[PDB]
Amino acid sequence: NKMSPYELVQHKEESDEIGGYFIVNGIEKLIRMLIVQRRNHPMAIIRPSFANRGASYSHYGIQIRSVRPDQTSQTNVLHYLNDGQVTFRFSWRKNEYLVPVVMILKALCHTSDREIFDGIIGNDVKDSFLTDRLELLLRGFKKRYPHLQNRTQVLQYLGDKFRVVFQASPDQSDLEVGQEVLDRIVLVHLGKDGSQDKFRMLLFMIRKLYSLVAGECSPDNPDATQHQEVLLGGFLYGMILKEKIDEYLQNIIAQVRMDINRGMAINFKDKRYMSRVLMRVNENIGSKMQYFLSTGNLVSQSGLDLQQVSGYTVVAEKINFYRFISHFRMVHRGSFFAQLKTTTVRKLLPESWGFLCPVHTPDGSPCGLLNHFAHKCRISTQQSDVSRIPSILYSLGVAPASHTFAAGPSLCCVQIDGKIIGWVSHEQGKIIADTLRYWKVEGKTPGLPIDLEIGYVPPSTRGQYPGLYLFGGHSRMLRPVRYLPLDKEDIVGPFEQVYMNIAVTPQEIQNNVHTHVEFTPTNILSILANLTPFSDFNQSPRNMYQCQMGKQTMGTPGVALCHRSDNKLYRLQTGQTPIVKANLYDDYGMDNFPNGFNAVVAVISYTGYDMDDAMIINKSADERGFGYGT
Amino acid sequence: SSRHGQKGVCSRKWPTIDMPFSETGIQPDIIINPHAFPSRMTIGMFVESLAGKAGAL
Amino acid sequence: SEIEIESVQDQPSVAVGSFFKGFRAPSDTTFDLYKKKKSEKDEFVLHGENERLEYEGYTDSSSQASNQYVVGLFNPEKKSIQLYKAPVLVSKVVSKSSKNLRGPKIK
Amino acid sequence: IVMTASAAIKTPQMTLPIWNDVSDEQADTFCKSISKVLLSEVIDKVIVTETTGARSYVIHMRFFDNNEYSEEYDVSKEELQNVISNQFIHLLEAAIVKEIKKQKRTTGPDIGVAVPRLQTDVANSSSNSKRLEEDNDEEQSHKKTKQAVSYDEPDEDEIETMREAEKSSDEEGIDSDKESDSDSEVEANNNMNKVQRDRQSAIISHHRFITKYNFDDESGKWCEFKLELAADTEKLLMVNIVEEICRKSIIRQIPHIDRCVHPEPENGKRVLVTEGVNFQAMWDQEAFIDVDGITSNDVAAVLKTYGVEAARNTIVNEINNVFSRYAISVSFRHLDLIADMMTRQGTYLAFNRQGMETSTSSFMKMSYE
Amino acid sequence: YQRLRHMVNDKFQVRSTGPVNSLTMQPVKGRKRHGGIRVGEMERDALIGHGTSFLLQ
Amino acid sequence: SVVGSLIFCLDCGDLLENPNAVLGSNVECSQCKAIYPKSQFSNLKVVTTTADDAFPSSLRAKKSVVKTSLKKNELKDGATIKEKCPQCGNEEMNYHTLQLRSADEGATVFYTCTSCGYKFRTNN
Amino acid sequence: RTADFRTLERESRFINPPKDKSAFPLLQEAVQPHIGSFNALTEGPDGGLLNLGVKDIGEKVIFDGKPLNSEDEISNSGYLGNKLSVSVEQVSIAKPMSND
Amino acid sequence: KAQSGKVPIPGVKQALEKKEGLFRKHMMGKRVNYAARSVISPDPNI
Amino acid sequence: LRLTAEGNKWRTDILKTSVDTGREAAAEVTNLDKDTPADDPELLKRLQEILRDNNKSGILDAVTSSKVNAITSQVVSKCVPDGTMKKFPCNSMQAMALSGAKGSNVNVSQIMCLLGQQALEGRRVPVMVSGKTLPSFKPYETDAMAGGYVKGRFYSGIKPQEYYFHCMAGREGLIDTAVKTSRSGYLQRCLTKQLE
Amino acid sequence: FSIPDGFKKCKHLKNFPLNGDNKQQQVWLIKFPSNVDISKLKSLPVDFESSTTMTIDKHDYKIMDDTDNMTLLVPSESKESLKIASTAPLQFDKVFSVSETAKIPAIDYSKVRVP
Amino acid sequence: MIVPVRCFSCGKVVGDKWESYLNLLQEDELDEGTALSRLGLKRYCCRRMILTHVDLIEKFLRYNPLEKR
């Protein structure tokens, strides 16, 4: 860990040992990163396979992926039926359970039925589309469940129907189970002691549903790289590790209950009884975590929020160094999307500018599916101090979300990390978003970290749902640009980037449009797509192919080769540096791993033996050693 | 392969003497066919060829 | 366009309710006004009740930290206002008739 | 064409050669006479004022101007009267009593019961868990060292429609797909004439809920009626009921034919293109169409109407469209031999298990599949 | 220039009598056993299409 | 309080029962015990319009201000080159580029004739 | 000049590996997504994500099938027994060592 | 047409019906003696 | 590969006439007139209307594509035989295209003149939700270059914006690489068992 | 009531002179972030437009009106009782909002775009 | 690894000029241009073989399995 290149040499490693991979039965394997939906932000998806689920389901819907503070996900879809009925979908074990939304909303807090009506219909009281869809929702509940007159009596009801499925205990009352359903499922990025904020978000998510079915909100594309983030390696590794030490607590219960299926000897205050129980449970969890890394098979009876069960870990290859340093810079959309033959997910988009490399993707079957990150694209690792941001929005023009009672696209819902904190206008919203960017890159205000992304979305005729979204959490995608006031550095994510104006060179900065400029136009490329010499002169399928040819060269795997035991190593003997090279060749230290040699090359058709991609090597060059390798 | 996606197999280890020598006396190590260039448009290789010769001199 | 100040008042006399749109209680009602003793902009609690309805309210633990509200009283002659540092009681209303539960498990 | 012998092509067409003395104005007006007109296509707005007391729904329709939809569709305003009063409200009051029957019966699920699966496929949950990440220089390394040009599951719906057909019996659980089918039992105008008052009287007397009706016969610009339903009923999204029924109510559809269009001619052939096949109905339009020259790509329709030799010549003409589009010139001697093999029984057989059945040699049959 | 790791050293084979299979008495699959080049389904159709009956036999 | 076709209580904010599904002139709250047998708010209208994107037709597209339909001959690919069409001696011919095969294959150029209209296929 | 190969700086670094700090710091910023992700399991606020995660799965309980043997009251018949509640409150990955 | 753990024992009927099996693998698609394969190479002098 | 100094003077001036082409097409499609300026707010309302429809905005991507493809074929028609430094026999680049040895006149034009309109899925460059085709461009930028018209060439280089759009068109053919394989395999077997 | 501890109740409230005459009275609901001390501010520049440039102790302040629910409460005589202001609820007349602003600087376009 | 003995292209003996070249850049503080011409490397096929050498052997020699540490 805290170790010098001199000490890595003495302890039988390379002097620039990179790490980041597990050694499992000798084979070096690593956890592949993924692309999943951005956390804590209600997307506005339309999807044709919701009417394939049941009768009168529309294709409309609101989908939120809520993460807990231990990085465990929970996805809640909010459907729209053609009745006017609105439901609430979740998945608890591997099953899939639906509930009416006013059964949640009247269980989250004590609600007058107009505070449901006012929370959705904030103003725009006289909108005929909207005040009619909602009196099929309050009326349709009071009709169907007429014996629910307050908050506890629906928690009595909901904990009764959901008692067996949560494997709840016979001492728990129904409002202890029914409270646990609302603490384990709905909008869990707010947690316990956050019932009012889980109630403000669902009323936001209902107007976003109703403003989607009215065609006032463009549907959010879940491939558009502003609505998706990175599931990191070790974060997955501690999501599966929680579920294995949850099965360990269940096998203790399953072992004690198989002692009261018999009648042997049970006193739960006996120390020697406990050791008899715990010597029988298979407690070798580190073999269940090795088996994940050994195979890739995510096996969990609990069921994680990810929709495949394979390919989570891959073999870190060492056929050269360019192959190896590109595994750690590789991201993937998921194994579920290669099954399709609709090629929308494979298409390169403008919102991947500086986050995903346009060049460095594999030719062939994972073309578009297996893109790599760009050069200066840093992924967030921990979250930031956001407990001081609400006090700074209140110093600005924000009226709080506890007093205002006003919703819909006519205003600018200020949210940080998926918690609605207040409401402003749209003209005030752009001033708040811009002063926060000036207070961020000017590092004077204590509560603004530089990694906070300020996602202002201005209003527009039938565009994206306007608001002001601020994110600071884990696993985001960040890259630096130069803010044009102060000539500082600004950390910009992909949700921000759609509505900003980032000039490429300084010479192209036009007046009164650009607030940001790139540091270098080479920051949008990969590592390996950036080492192609003069790569703006080739045709684009030829830059993408060097990114596949260069991984498969035989070069230098490393210099500590007398202390390893690998299935295959290819090693080029006589490497040379390039005379023609990029300056990022030196910054990554690719001289330690010479991949290739210089050759006096004559472009000539002389022999007749070279057509159709054939080449002629010199014989005496070969005899004197020329690309010799073992 | 060069660094521009111009891969090709070795067709023949061609002997030294019957291979075009230069005014300088240099004989090339690799002969590449000029017909591989129009269909591929790798002009990053035509500029690498005279940037690596200026840099060697 | 300037307007001066009549007077400055600190002590809690005036409060502001935050109810649903159209909360029109029977006007024979009194309100309790509580205050947690911690010597800054403190968190206040409402309570008030008639024979049929009953309600408590409270201030927001987050937004009462660094956002503060003032009630002003303007004489158009004198072109100056007097100030009264008022909280906001974010309040709900419960029904005294309907507070029943059931057998708390399936038994 | 070659496989599966499609009786139902997904996009059937019909080429209608117009005469030499018909003109282009006369031909575009003719396309408007054949092309179907949904009642949705002549409506600008529907303004539903719902009031209560009996739930008195008032439906006001705003058409486009009469000089506009009579150019765009050649639809007279008398035909709007003769579709609203005789087809629309029969569909509208059918959708209402269906929706009140939904109101009393089914309004709530069972909370706590798991619904079935969400987004998995019918099989294997993915294409391949490991081989789906093989690049074309690595996947051509696995298809060079072995004879691996085959695909186990060739991944086709026509293969699946060749896997799914030819049902079990008529003595099954459902003999004719039987179900219940039971348990039924601005402006401010007035001053109609005697005619529109008496048209309204038999319109109310022949529908279930009409109770008032009017139609703008002077301009053809609006329509108006007042569905006054029961008082027991509750809130009902009437505008979503109307938008479905307007998109389904046909004004003028020649059957099996959706839309005709007059494209740019190839080599002096002034023709039409008809999205759908109905040979029997185009025979009665001989004042505009040379009926002895109409050409389809639905081979199973030319077989049914013009015999087996015209079905043969359609096969060689429609295989050639597939190759001449890509500028690929196969010979006609190869296309004649396939079309003579597909029509060797006098029917339209394809190359599949069902076509292969009528054959002499059994080792050809056993070795196929 | 660069040199790629996938090389043509593990490609060729030649068969003259070889080991056979036990059920069908046909030549055996395997570059390790050095036998079994496959005249498959499509290569049979080429030999019918030439009309040569004794190259198919 | 009356908002739209809805009516709410002034005490518990509760949605009142539909004033014509009940017996004669007595509606009350269920959380509160409301005092409305007066039925003072009877007649309620909700004027609702269909959507402006609800009935799509070719006549509505002409009511748009932007152009919604290219005409018979408003599309001519100007990307032309003097590739000789030999079936009539035509020089001007349209073109269009892609990369279909693996990325070790030359560019695929898609030609299109102008006068005779006879198509051509060019691999490399 | 335009670029330079660092042909005395390379050779002085091959012979003498750096004793204080790694050269080429952009190569350790390439895997900071991977290493920092694993570091958050055992470090950061709340003792990492694993100690913060074992409390989201708090209690797995059962009961016995034996009475309290109290007086004849209504809690004597509808009674399960004494109640264990097994829990995990701290998880600690050690470091690779070896033992014999 | 019998019952099987996950994938039961193959019967004599199911040894016959796919691309593999018998009737297409060993009757239309036999492997031959006196054959060879190799990488090909260009030559203008033949 | 190099043009002569006269011929390199021509293509600068012919491409100087395409700086005002993305707006003449954008004002034609919206049925405005008299050359409304690019930042006219009524135009920016109209261009947002054709951003939200898919049967529109291929209208703008067929008008503006044809209106810049003319400037593409005016540069080719004046430069590649006559503005080159080396004429036909000695220019081996042209002599490999005219012979049919390897290449075409399209390949020679993208080297010496300009790449041109990089057209995606038949239409043109895709746009964001914000009316921006890259983060470097103004929203609803009426320009040929913002719509993906590469005025650069492979001899001199393509700018970082138009480098990116050519990477989009390089990928849309490469998704039709894997769907090629098992199309006609089963179709030909099923023919060759009957016609056998 | 007052179930979590610490909730001192209030007894010695002052009298808010809401007259109800007919000179006249207007009841406002001005707003402040807590960073400014209200005794130390003396005037209050307020306009019906946003033209409300105020600056206190090197801090740019901005008073914003928003004309287009919150209920005023006043004590009875001395006991708390906080009864609802009305005439027969009370809607206010004007609501204001002090907002701290900053001046983002003009981009020095001469230095920042080098040819 | 170690310096090649001969030039690949022409064939002039190059492997005796690597330790001389590192003195011409350290002691004499010359550029790469004059340090090659003083050693007699005058054809650019053999100038590019001293100029471009990586000398990876000094990185391999640090892993000695035949001595302690």
CA atoms within 13 A on the CB side of J77: 0
- Phi, psi (degrees; rounded to nearest 5) at A453: -100, 135
Burial class from Cβ neighbours inside 10 Å (0-12, 13-18, 19+) for residue G61 reads middle
| DSSP H or E run through J60 | strand J60-65
- Phi, psi (degrees; rounded to nearest 5) at A616: -115, 120
User: Is the separation of the CB atoms in A501 and A510 below 8 Å?
Assistant: no
- How many Å apart are CA J45 and CA E21, to the nearest integer? 102
Nearest residue to C21 (alpha-carbon basis) of K30, A403, K18, G58: A403
Nearest residue to D111 (alpha-carbon basis) of I54, A144, A566, A262: A144
User: Is the separation of the CB atoms in A179 and A155 below 8 Å?
Assistant: yes
Strand D271-276 and strand D257-261: the pairing is: antiparallel
Strand A228-231 and strand G60-61: the pairing is: unpaired
- How many Å apart are CA I160 and CA E44, to the nearest integer? 54
F35 touches chain C (CB under 8 A): no
**What one-character DSSP code corresponds to residue A326?**
T
CA atoms within 13 A on the CB side of A85: 21
What's the CA angle centered on K7, arms K1 and K9, to 5 degrees?
125
What's the CA angle centered on I190, arms I185 and I191, to 5 degrees?
105
- How many Å apart are CA A385 and CA A450, to the nearest integer? 10
> What would the two tokens of residue F107 be?
């560019």
Question: Is the domain of A423 the same as that of A339?
Answer: no
| Sign, CA torsion A195/A201/A206/A209 | negative
Residue A50 vs residues A46, A53, A464, F24: alpha-carbon distances, Å: 9, 5, 22, 44
Kindly list the partner chains of chain I, i.e. chains with 3 or more CB atom pairs below 8 Å: A, B, D, E, F
Please name the amino acid found at residue D53.
G
Question: Is the domain of A355 the same as that of A386?
Answer: no
Question: Is the domain of A71 the same as that of A169?
Answer: yes
* K46 appears as a binding residue in the annotation: yes
B11 touches chain H (CB under 8 A): yes
User: Is the separation of the CB atoms in A319 and A570 below 8 Å?
Assistant: yes
User: Is the separation of the CB atoms in A233 and G33 below 8 Å?
Assistant: yes
Distance of CA A89 to the CA centre of its chain: 21
**What one-character DSSP code corresponds to residue G10?**
T
Strand B9-14 and strand A614-618: the pairing is: parallel
> Looking at CA atoms only, how far is residue J105 from chain C in angstroms?
27
Q: In this complex, which of K9, K60, K65 lies closest to A600 when CB atoms are compared?
A: K9
Cβ–Cβ below 8 Å for B26 and K45: yes
- Interface probe with C: pick from A116, A126, A145, A150, most Cβ of C within 10 Å: A150
- Phi, psi (degrees; rounded to nearest 5) at I67: -80, -20
For chains D and F, what is the number of CB pairs under 8 angstroms?
Answer: 85
Chain F hits for I172, Cβ within 8 Å: 98
- How many Å apart are CA D336 and CA J112, to the nearest integer? 74
* F85 appears as a binding residue in the annotation: yes
- Search chain C and give the residue with CA nearest A173: C104
- How many Å apart are CA G90 and CA G84, to the nearest integer? 19
Q: In this complex, which of J27, J43, J72 lies closest to C2 when CB atoms are compared?
A: J43
Tell me the residues of chain I between 153 and 172 that have a Cβ less than 8 Å away from chain A. 154-155, 157-161, 163-164, 166-172
Residue F51 vs residues D61, D186, I195, J110: alpha-carbon distances, Å: 13, 18, 58, 51
Domain containing residue K42: CATH number = 1.10.10.60
User: Is the separation of the CB atoms in F11 and F1 below 8 Å?
Assistant: no
**What one-character DSSP code corresponds to residue A449?**
-
Tell me the residues of chain K between 8 and 67 that have a Cβ less than 8 Å away from chain B. 8-10, 43-45, 47-48, 51
B56 touches chain K (CB under 8 A): yes
Cβ count within 10 A of residue J111: 9
Where chain H is discontinuous (C–N > 2.5 Å), the residues before each break are 3
Residue J115 vs residues A89, I157, I183: alpha-carbon distances, Å: 57, 18, 54
Ranges assigned E (strand) in A15-157 = 22-24, 27-31, 34-37, 57-67, 73-81, 87-90, 97-100
- How many Å apart are CA D302 and CA D343, to the nearest integer? 13
Residue A234 vs residues A293, A493, C14, D168: alpha-carbon distances, Å: 11, 22, 55, 54
- How many Å apart are CA J79 and CA C17, to the nearest integer? 18
- How many Å apart are CA I26 and CA I51, to the nearest integer? 12
User: Is the separation of the CB atoms in A533 and A581 below 8 Å?
Assistant: yes
Q: Please give the radius of gyration of chain C, using alpha carbons only, rounded to the nearest integer.
A: 19
The residue whose two tokens read 């930028």 is I141
Widest CA span of chain E, in angstroms?
52
Range(s) of the domain holding residue K40:
1-69
User: Is the separation of the CB atoms in D134 and A365 below 8 Å?
Assistant: yes
- Within 8 A by CB and 6+ apart from E48, the residues are E56, I196
Range(s) of the domain holding residue A490:
474-526
**What one-character DSSP code corresponds to residue F101?**
S
Q: Are there at least 3 beta-carbon pairs closer than 8 Å between G and K? A: yes
- Within 8 A by CB and 6+ apart from K65, the residues are A562, A563
- How many Å apart are CA A408 and CA A122, to the nearest integer? 7
Nearest residue to A553 (alpha-carbon basis) of A585, A525, A520, A528: A528
Cβ count within 10 A of residue J26: 13
- Within 8 A by CB and 6+ apart from C35, the residues are C12, C42, C44, C45, J7, J8, J9, J10
Distance of CA C107 to the CA centre of its chain: 43
> What would the two tokens of residue D101 be?
């029957």
Cβ count within 10 A of residue D116: 9
- Phi, psi (degrees; rounded to nearest 5) at C25: -75, 160
- Search chain H and give the residue with CA nearest B9: H41
> What would the two tokens of residue B43 be?
């002009």
Q: How many domains, in total, are found in chain K?
A: 1
- Search chain K and give the residue with CA nearest A600: K45
Please name the amino acid found at residue A398.
V
Nearest residue to D353 (alpha-carbon basis) of D166, D167, D170, D168: D166
- How many Å apart are CA A376 and CA A355, to the nearest integer? 8
- Search chain B and give the residue with CA nearest A578: B52
- The SS3 call for residue A232 is coil
Nearest residue to A97 (alpha-carbon basis) of A158, A173, A171: A158
Q: Please give the radius of gyration of chain G, using alpha carbons only, rounded to the nearest integer.
A: 29
What's the CA angle centered on A60, arms A55 and A62, to 5 degrees?
115
User: Is the separation of the CB atoms in A241 and A247 below 8 Å?
Assistant: no
**What one-character DSSP code corresponds to residue I100?**
S
**What one-character DSSP code corresponds to residue A46?**
B
Q: How many separate helices (H) and strands (E) can be counted in chain G?
A: 4, 2
- The SS3 call for residue A432 is helix
- How many Å apart are CA B6 and CA G98, to the nearest integer? 51
- How many Å apart are CA C12 and CA C7, to the nearest integer? 15
User: Is the separation of the CB atoms in A500 and A484 below 8 Å?
Assistant: no
> Which strands make up the sheet holding D14-17, listed edge to edge?
D257-261, D271-276, D14-17, D295-296
- Within 8 A by CB and 6+ apart from I24, the residues are I35, I67
Question: Is the domain of A343 the same as that of A424?
Answer: no
B10 touches chain E (CB under 8 A): no
- The SS3 call for residue D96 is helix
The residue whose two tokens read 């005729």 is A461
Write down the H helix ranges in D106-248.
157-163, 194-206, 238-246
Q: In this complex, which of C21, C53, C98 lies closest to F11 when CB atoms are compared?
A: C53
- Within 8 A by CB and 6+ apart from A611, the residues are A605, B33, B35, H42
- How many Å apart are CA A263 and CA F55, to the nearest integer? 73
| DSSP H or E run through A293 | helix A285-295
- Within 8 A by CB and 6+ apart from G90, the residues are G47, G51, G54
Domain containing residue D69: CATH number = 3.30.70.2850
Nearest residue to A359 (alpha-carbon basis) of A530, A595, A580: A530
**What one-character DSSP code corresponds to residue D86?**
I
Q: In this complex, which of E11, E16, E41 lies closest to H34 when CB atoms are compared?
A: E16
Q: Hey, which residues does A456 pair with through a beta bridge?
A: A468
Burial class from Cβ neighbours inside 10 Å (0-12, 13-18, 19+) for residue A102 reads buried
* K27 appears as a binding residue in the annotation: no
The residue whose two tokens read 């395409």 is I18
Range(s) of the domain holding residue D203:
37-253
D357 touches chain A (CB under 8 A): no
CATH topology of domain I1-159: Topoisomerase I; Chain A, domain 4 (1.10.132)
- How many Å apart are CA E5 and CA E3, to the nearest integer? 7
- What are the boundaries of each domain within chain F? 1-124
Burial class from Cβ neighbours inside 10 Å (0-12, 13-18, 19+) for residue C45 reads buried
Cβ–Cβ below 8 Å for I196 and E41: no
Question: Alpha-carbon dihedral of residues F89, F91, F92, F97, nearest 10 degrees?
Answer: 110
User: Is the separation of the CB atoms in A352 and A330 below 8 Å?
Assistant: no
Chain I hits for F99, Cβ within 8 Å: 170, 173-174
- Phi, psi (degrees; rounded to nearest 5) at A150: -150, -165
* K37 appears as a binding residue in the annotation: no
- Phi, psi (degrees; rounded to nearest 5) at A36: -125, 170
> What would the two tokens of residue A176 be?
């202890």
> What would the two tokens of residue J58 be?
């090197």
3-state SS string over A455-519? Answer: EEECCCCCCCCCEEEEECCCCCEEEEEEECCCCEEEEECCCCHHHCCEECCHHHCCCCCCCEECC
H28 touches chain D (CB under 8 A): yes
Residue I48 vs residues A181, A426, A462: alpha-carbon distances, Å: 44, 19, 9
User: What Å resolution does this PDB entry report?
Assistant: 2.9
Q: Hey, which residues does D275 pair with through a beta bridge?
A: D259
Chain H hits for A610, Cβ within 8 Å: 42
Chain F hits for D235, Cβ within 8 Å: 5
- How many Å apart are CA A194 and CA A201, to the nearest integer? 11
- How many Å apart are CA C81 and CA C9, to the nearest integer? 12
Residue E7 vs residues A548, A549, A629, D101, J32: alpha-carbon distances, Å: 16, 13, 12, 74, 76
**What one-character DSSP code corresponds to residue D280?**
H
Residue A121 vs residues A117, A405, F3: alpha-carbon distances, Å: 6, 9, 11
- Interface probe with J: pick from C39, C41, C70, most Cβ of J within 10 Å: C70
User: Is the separation of the CB atoms in D214 and D189 below 8 Å?
Assistant: yes
Chain F hits for B37, Cβ within 8 Å: none
Cβ–Cβ below 8 Å for I196 and E48: yes
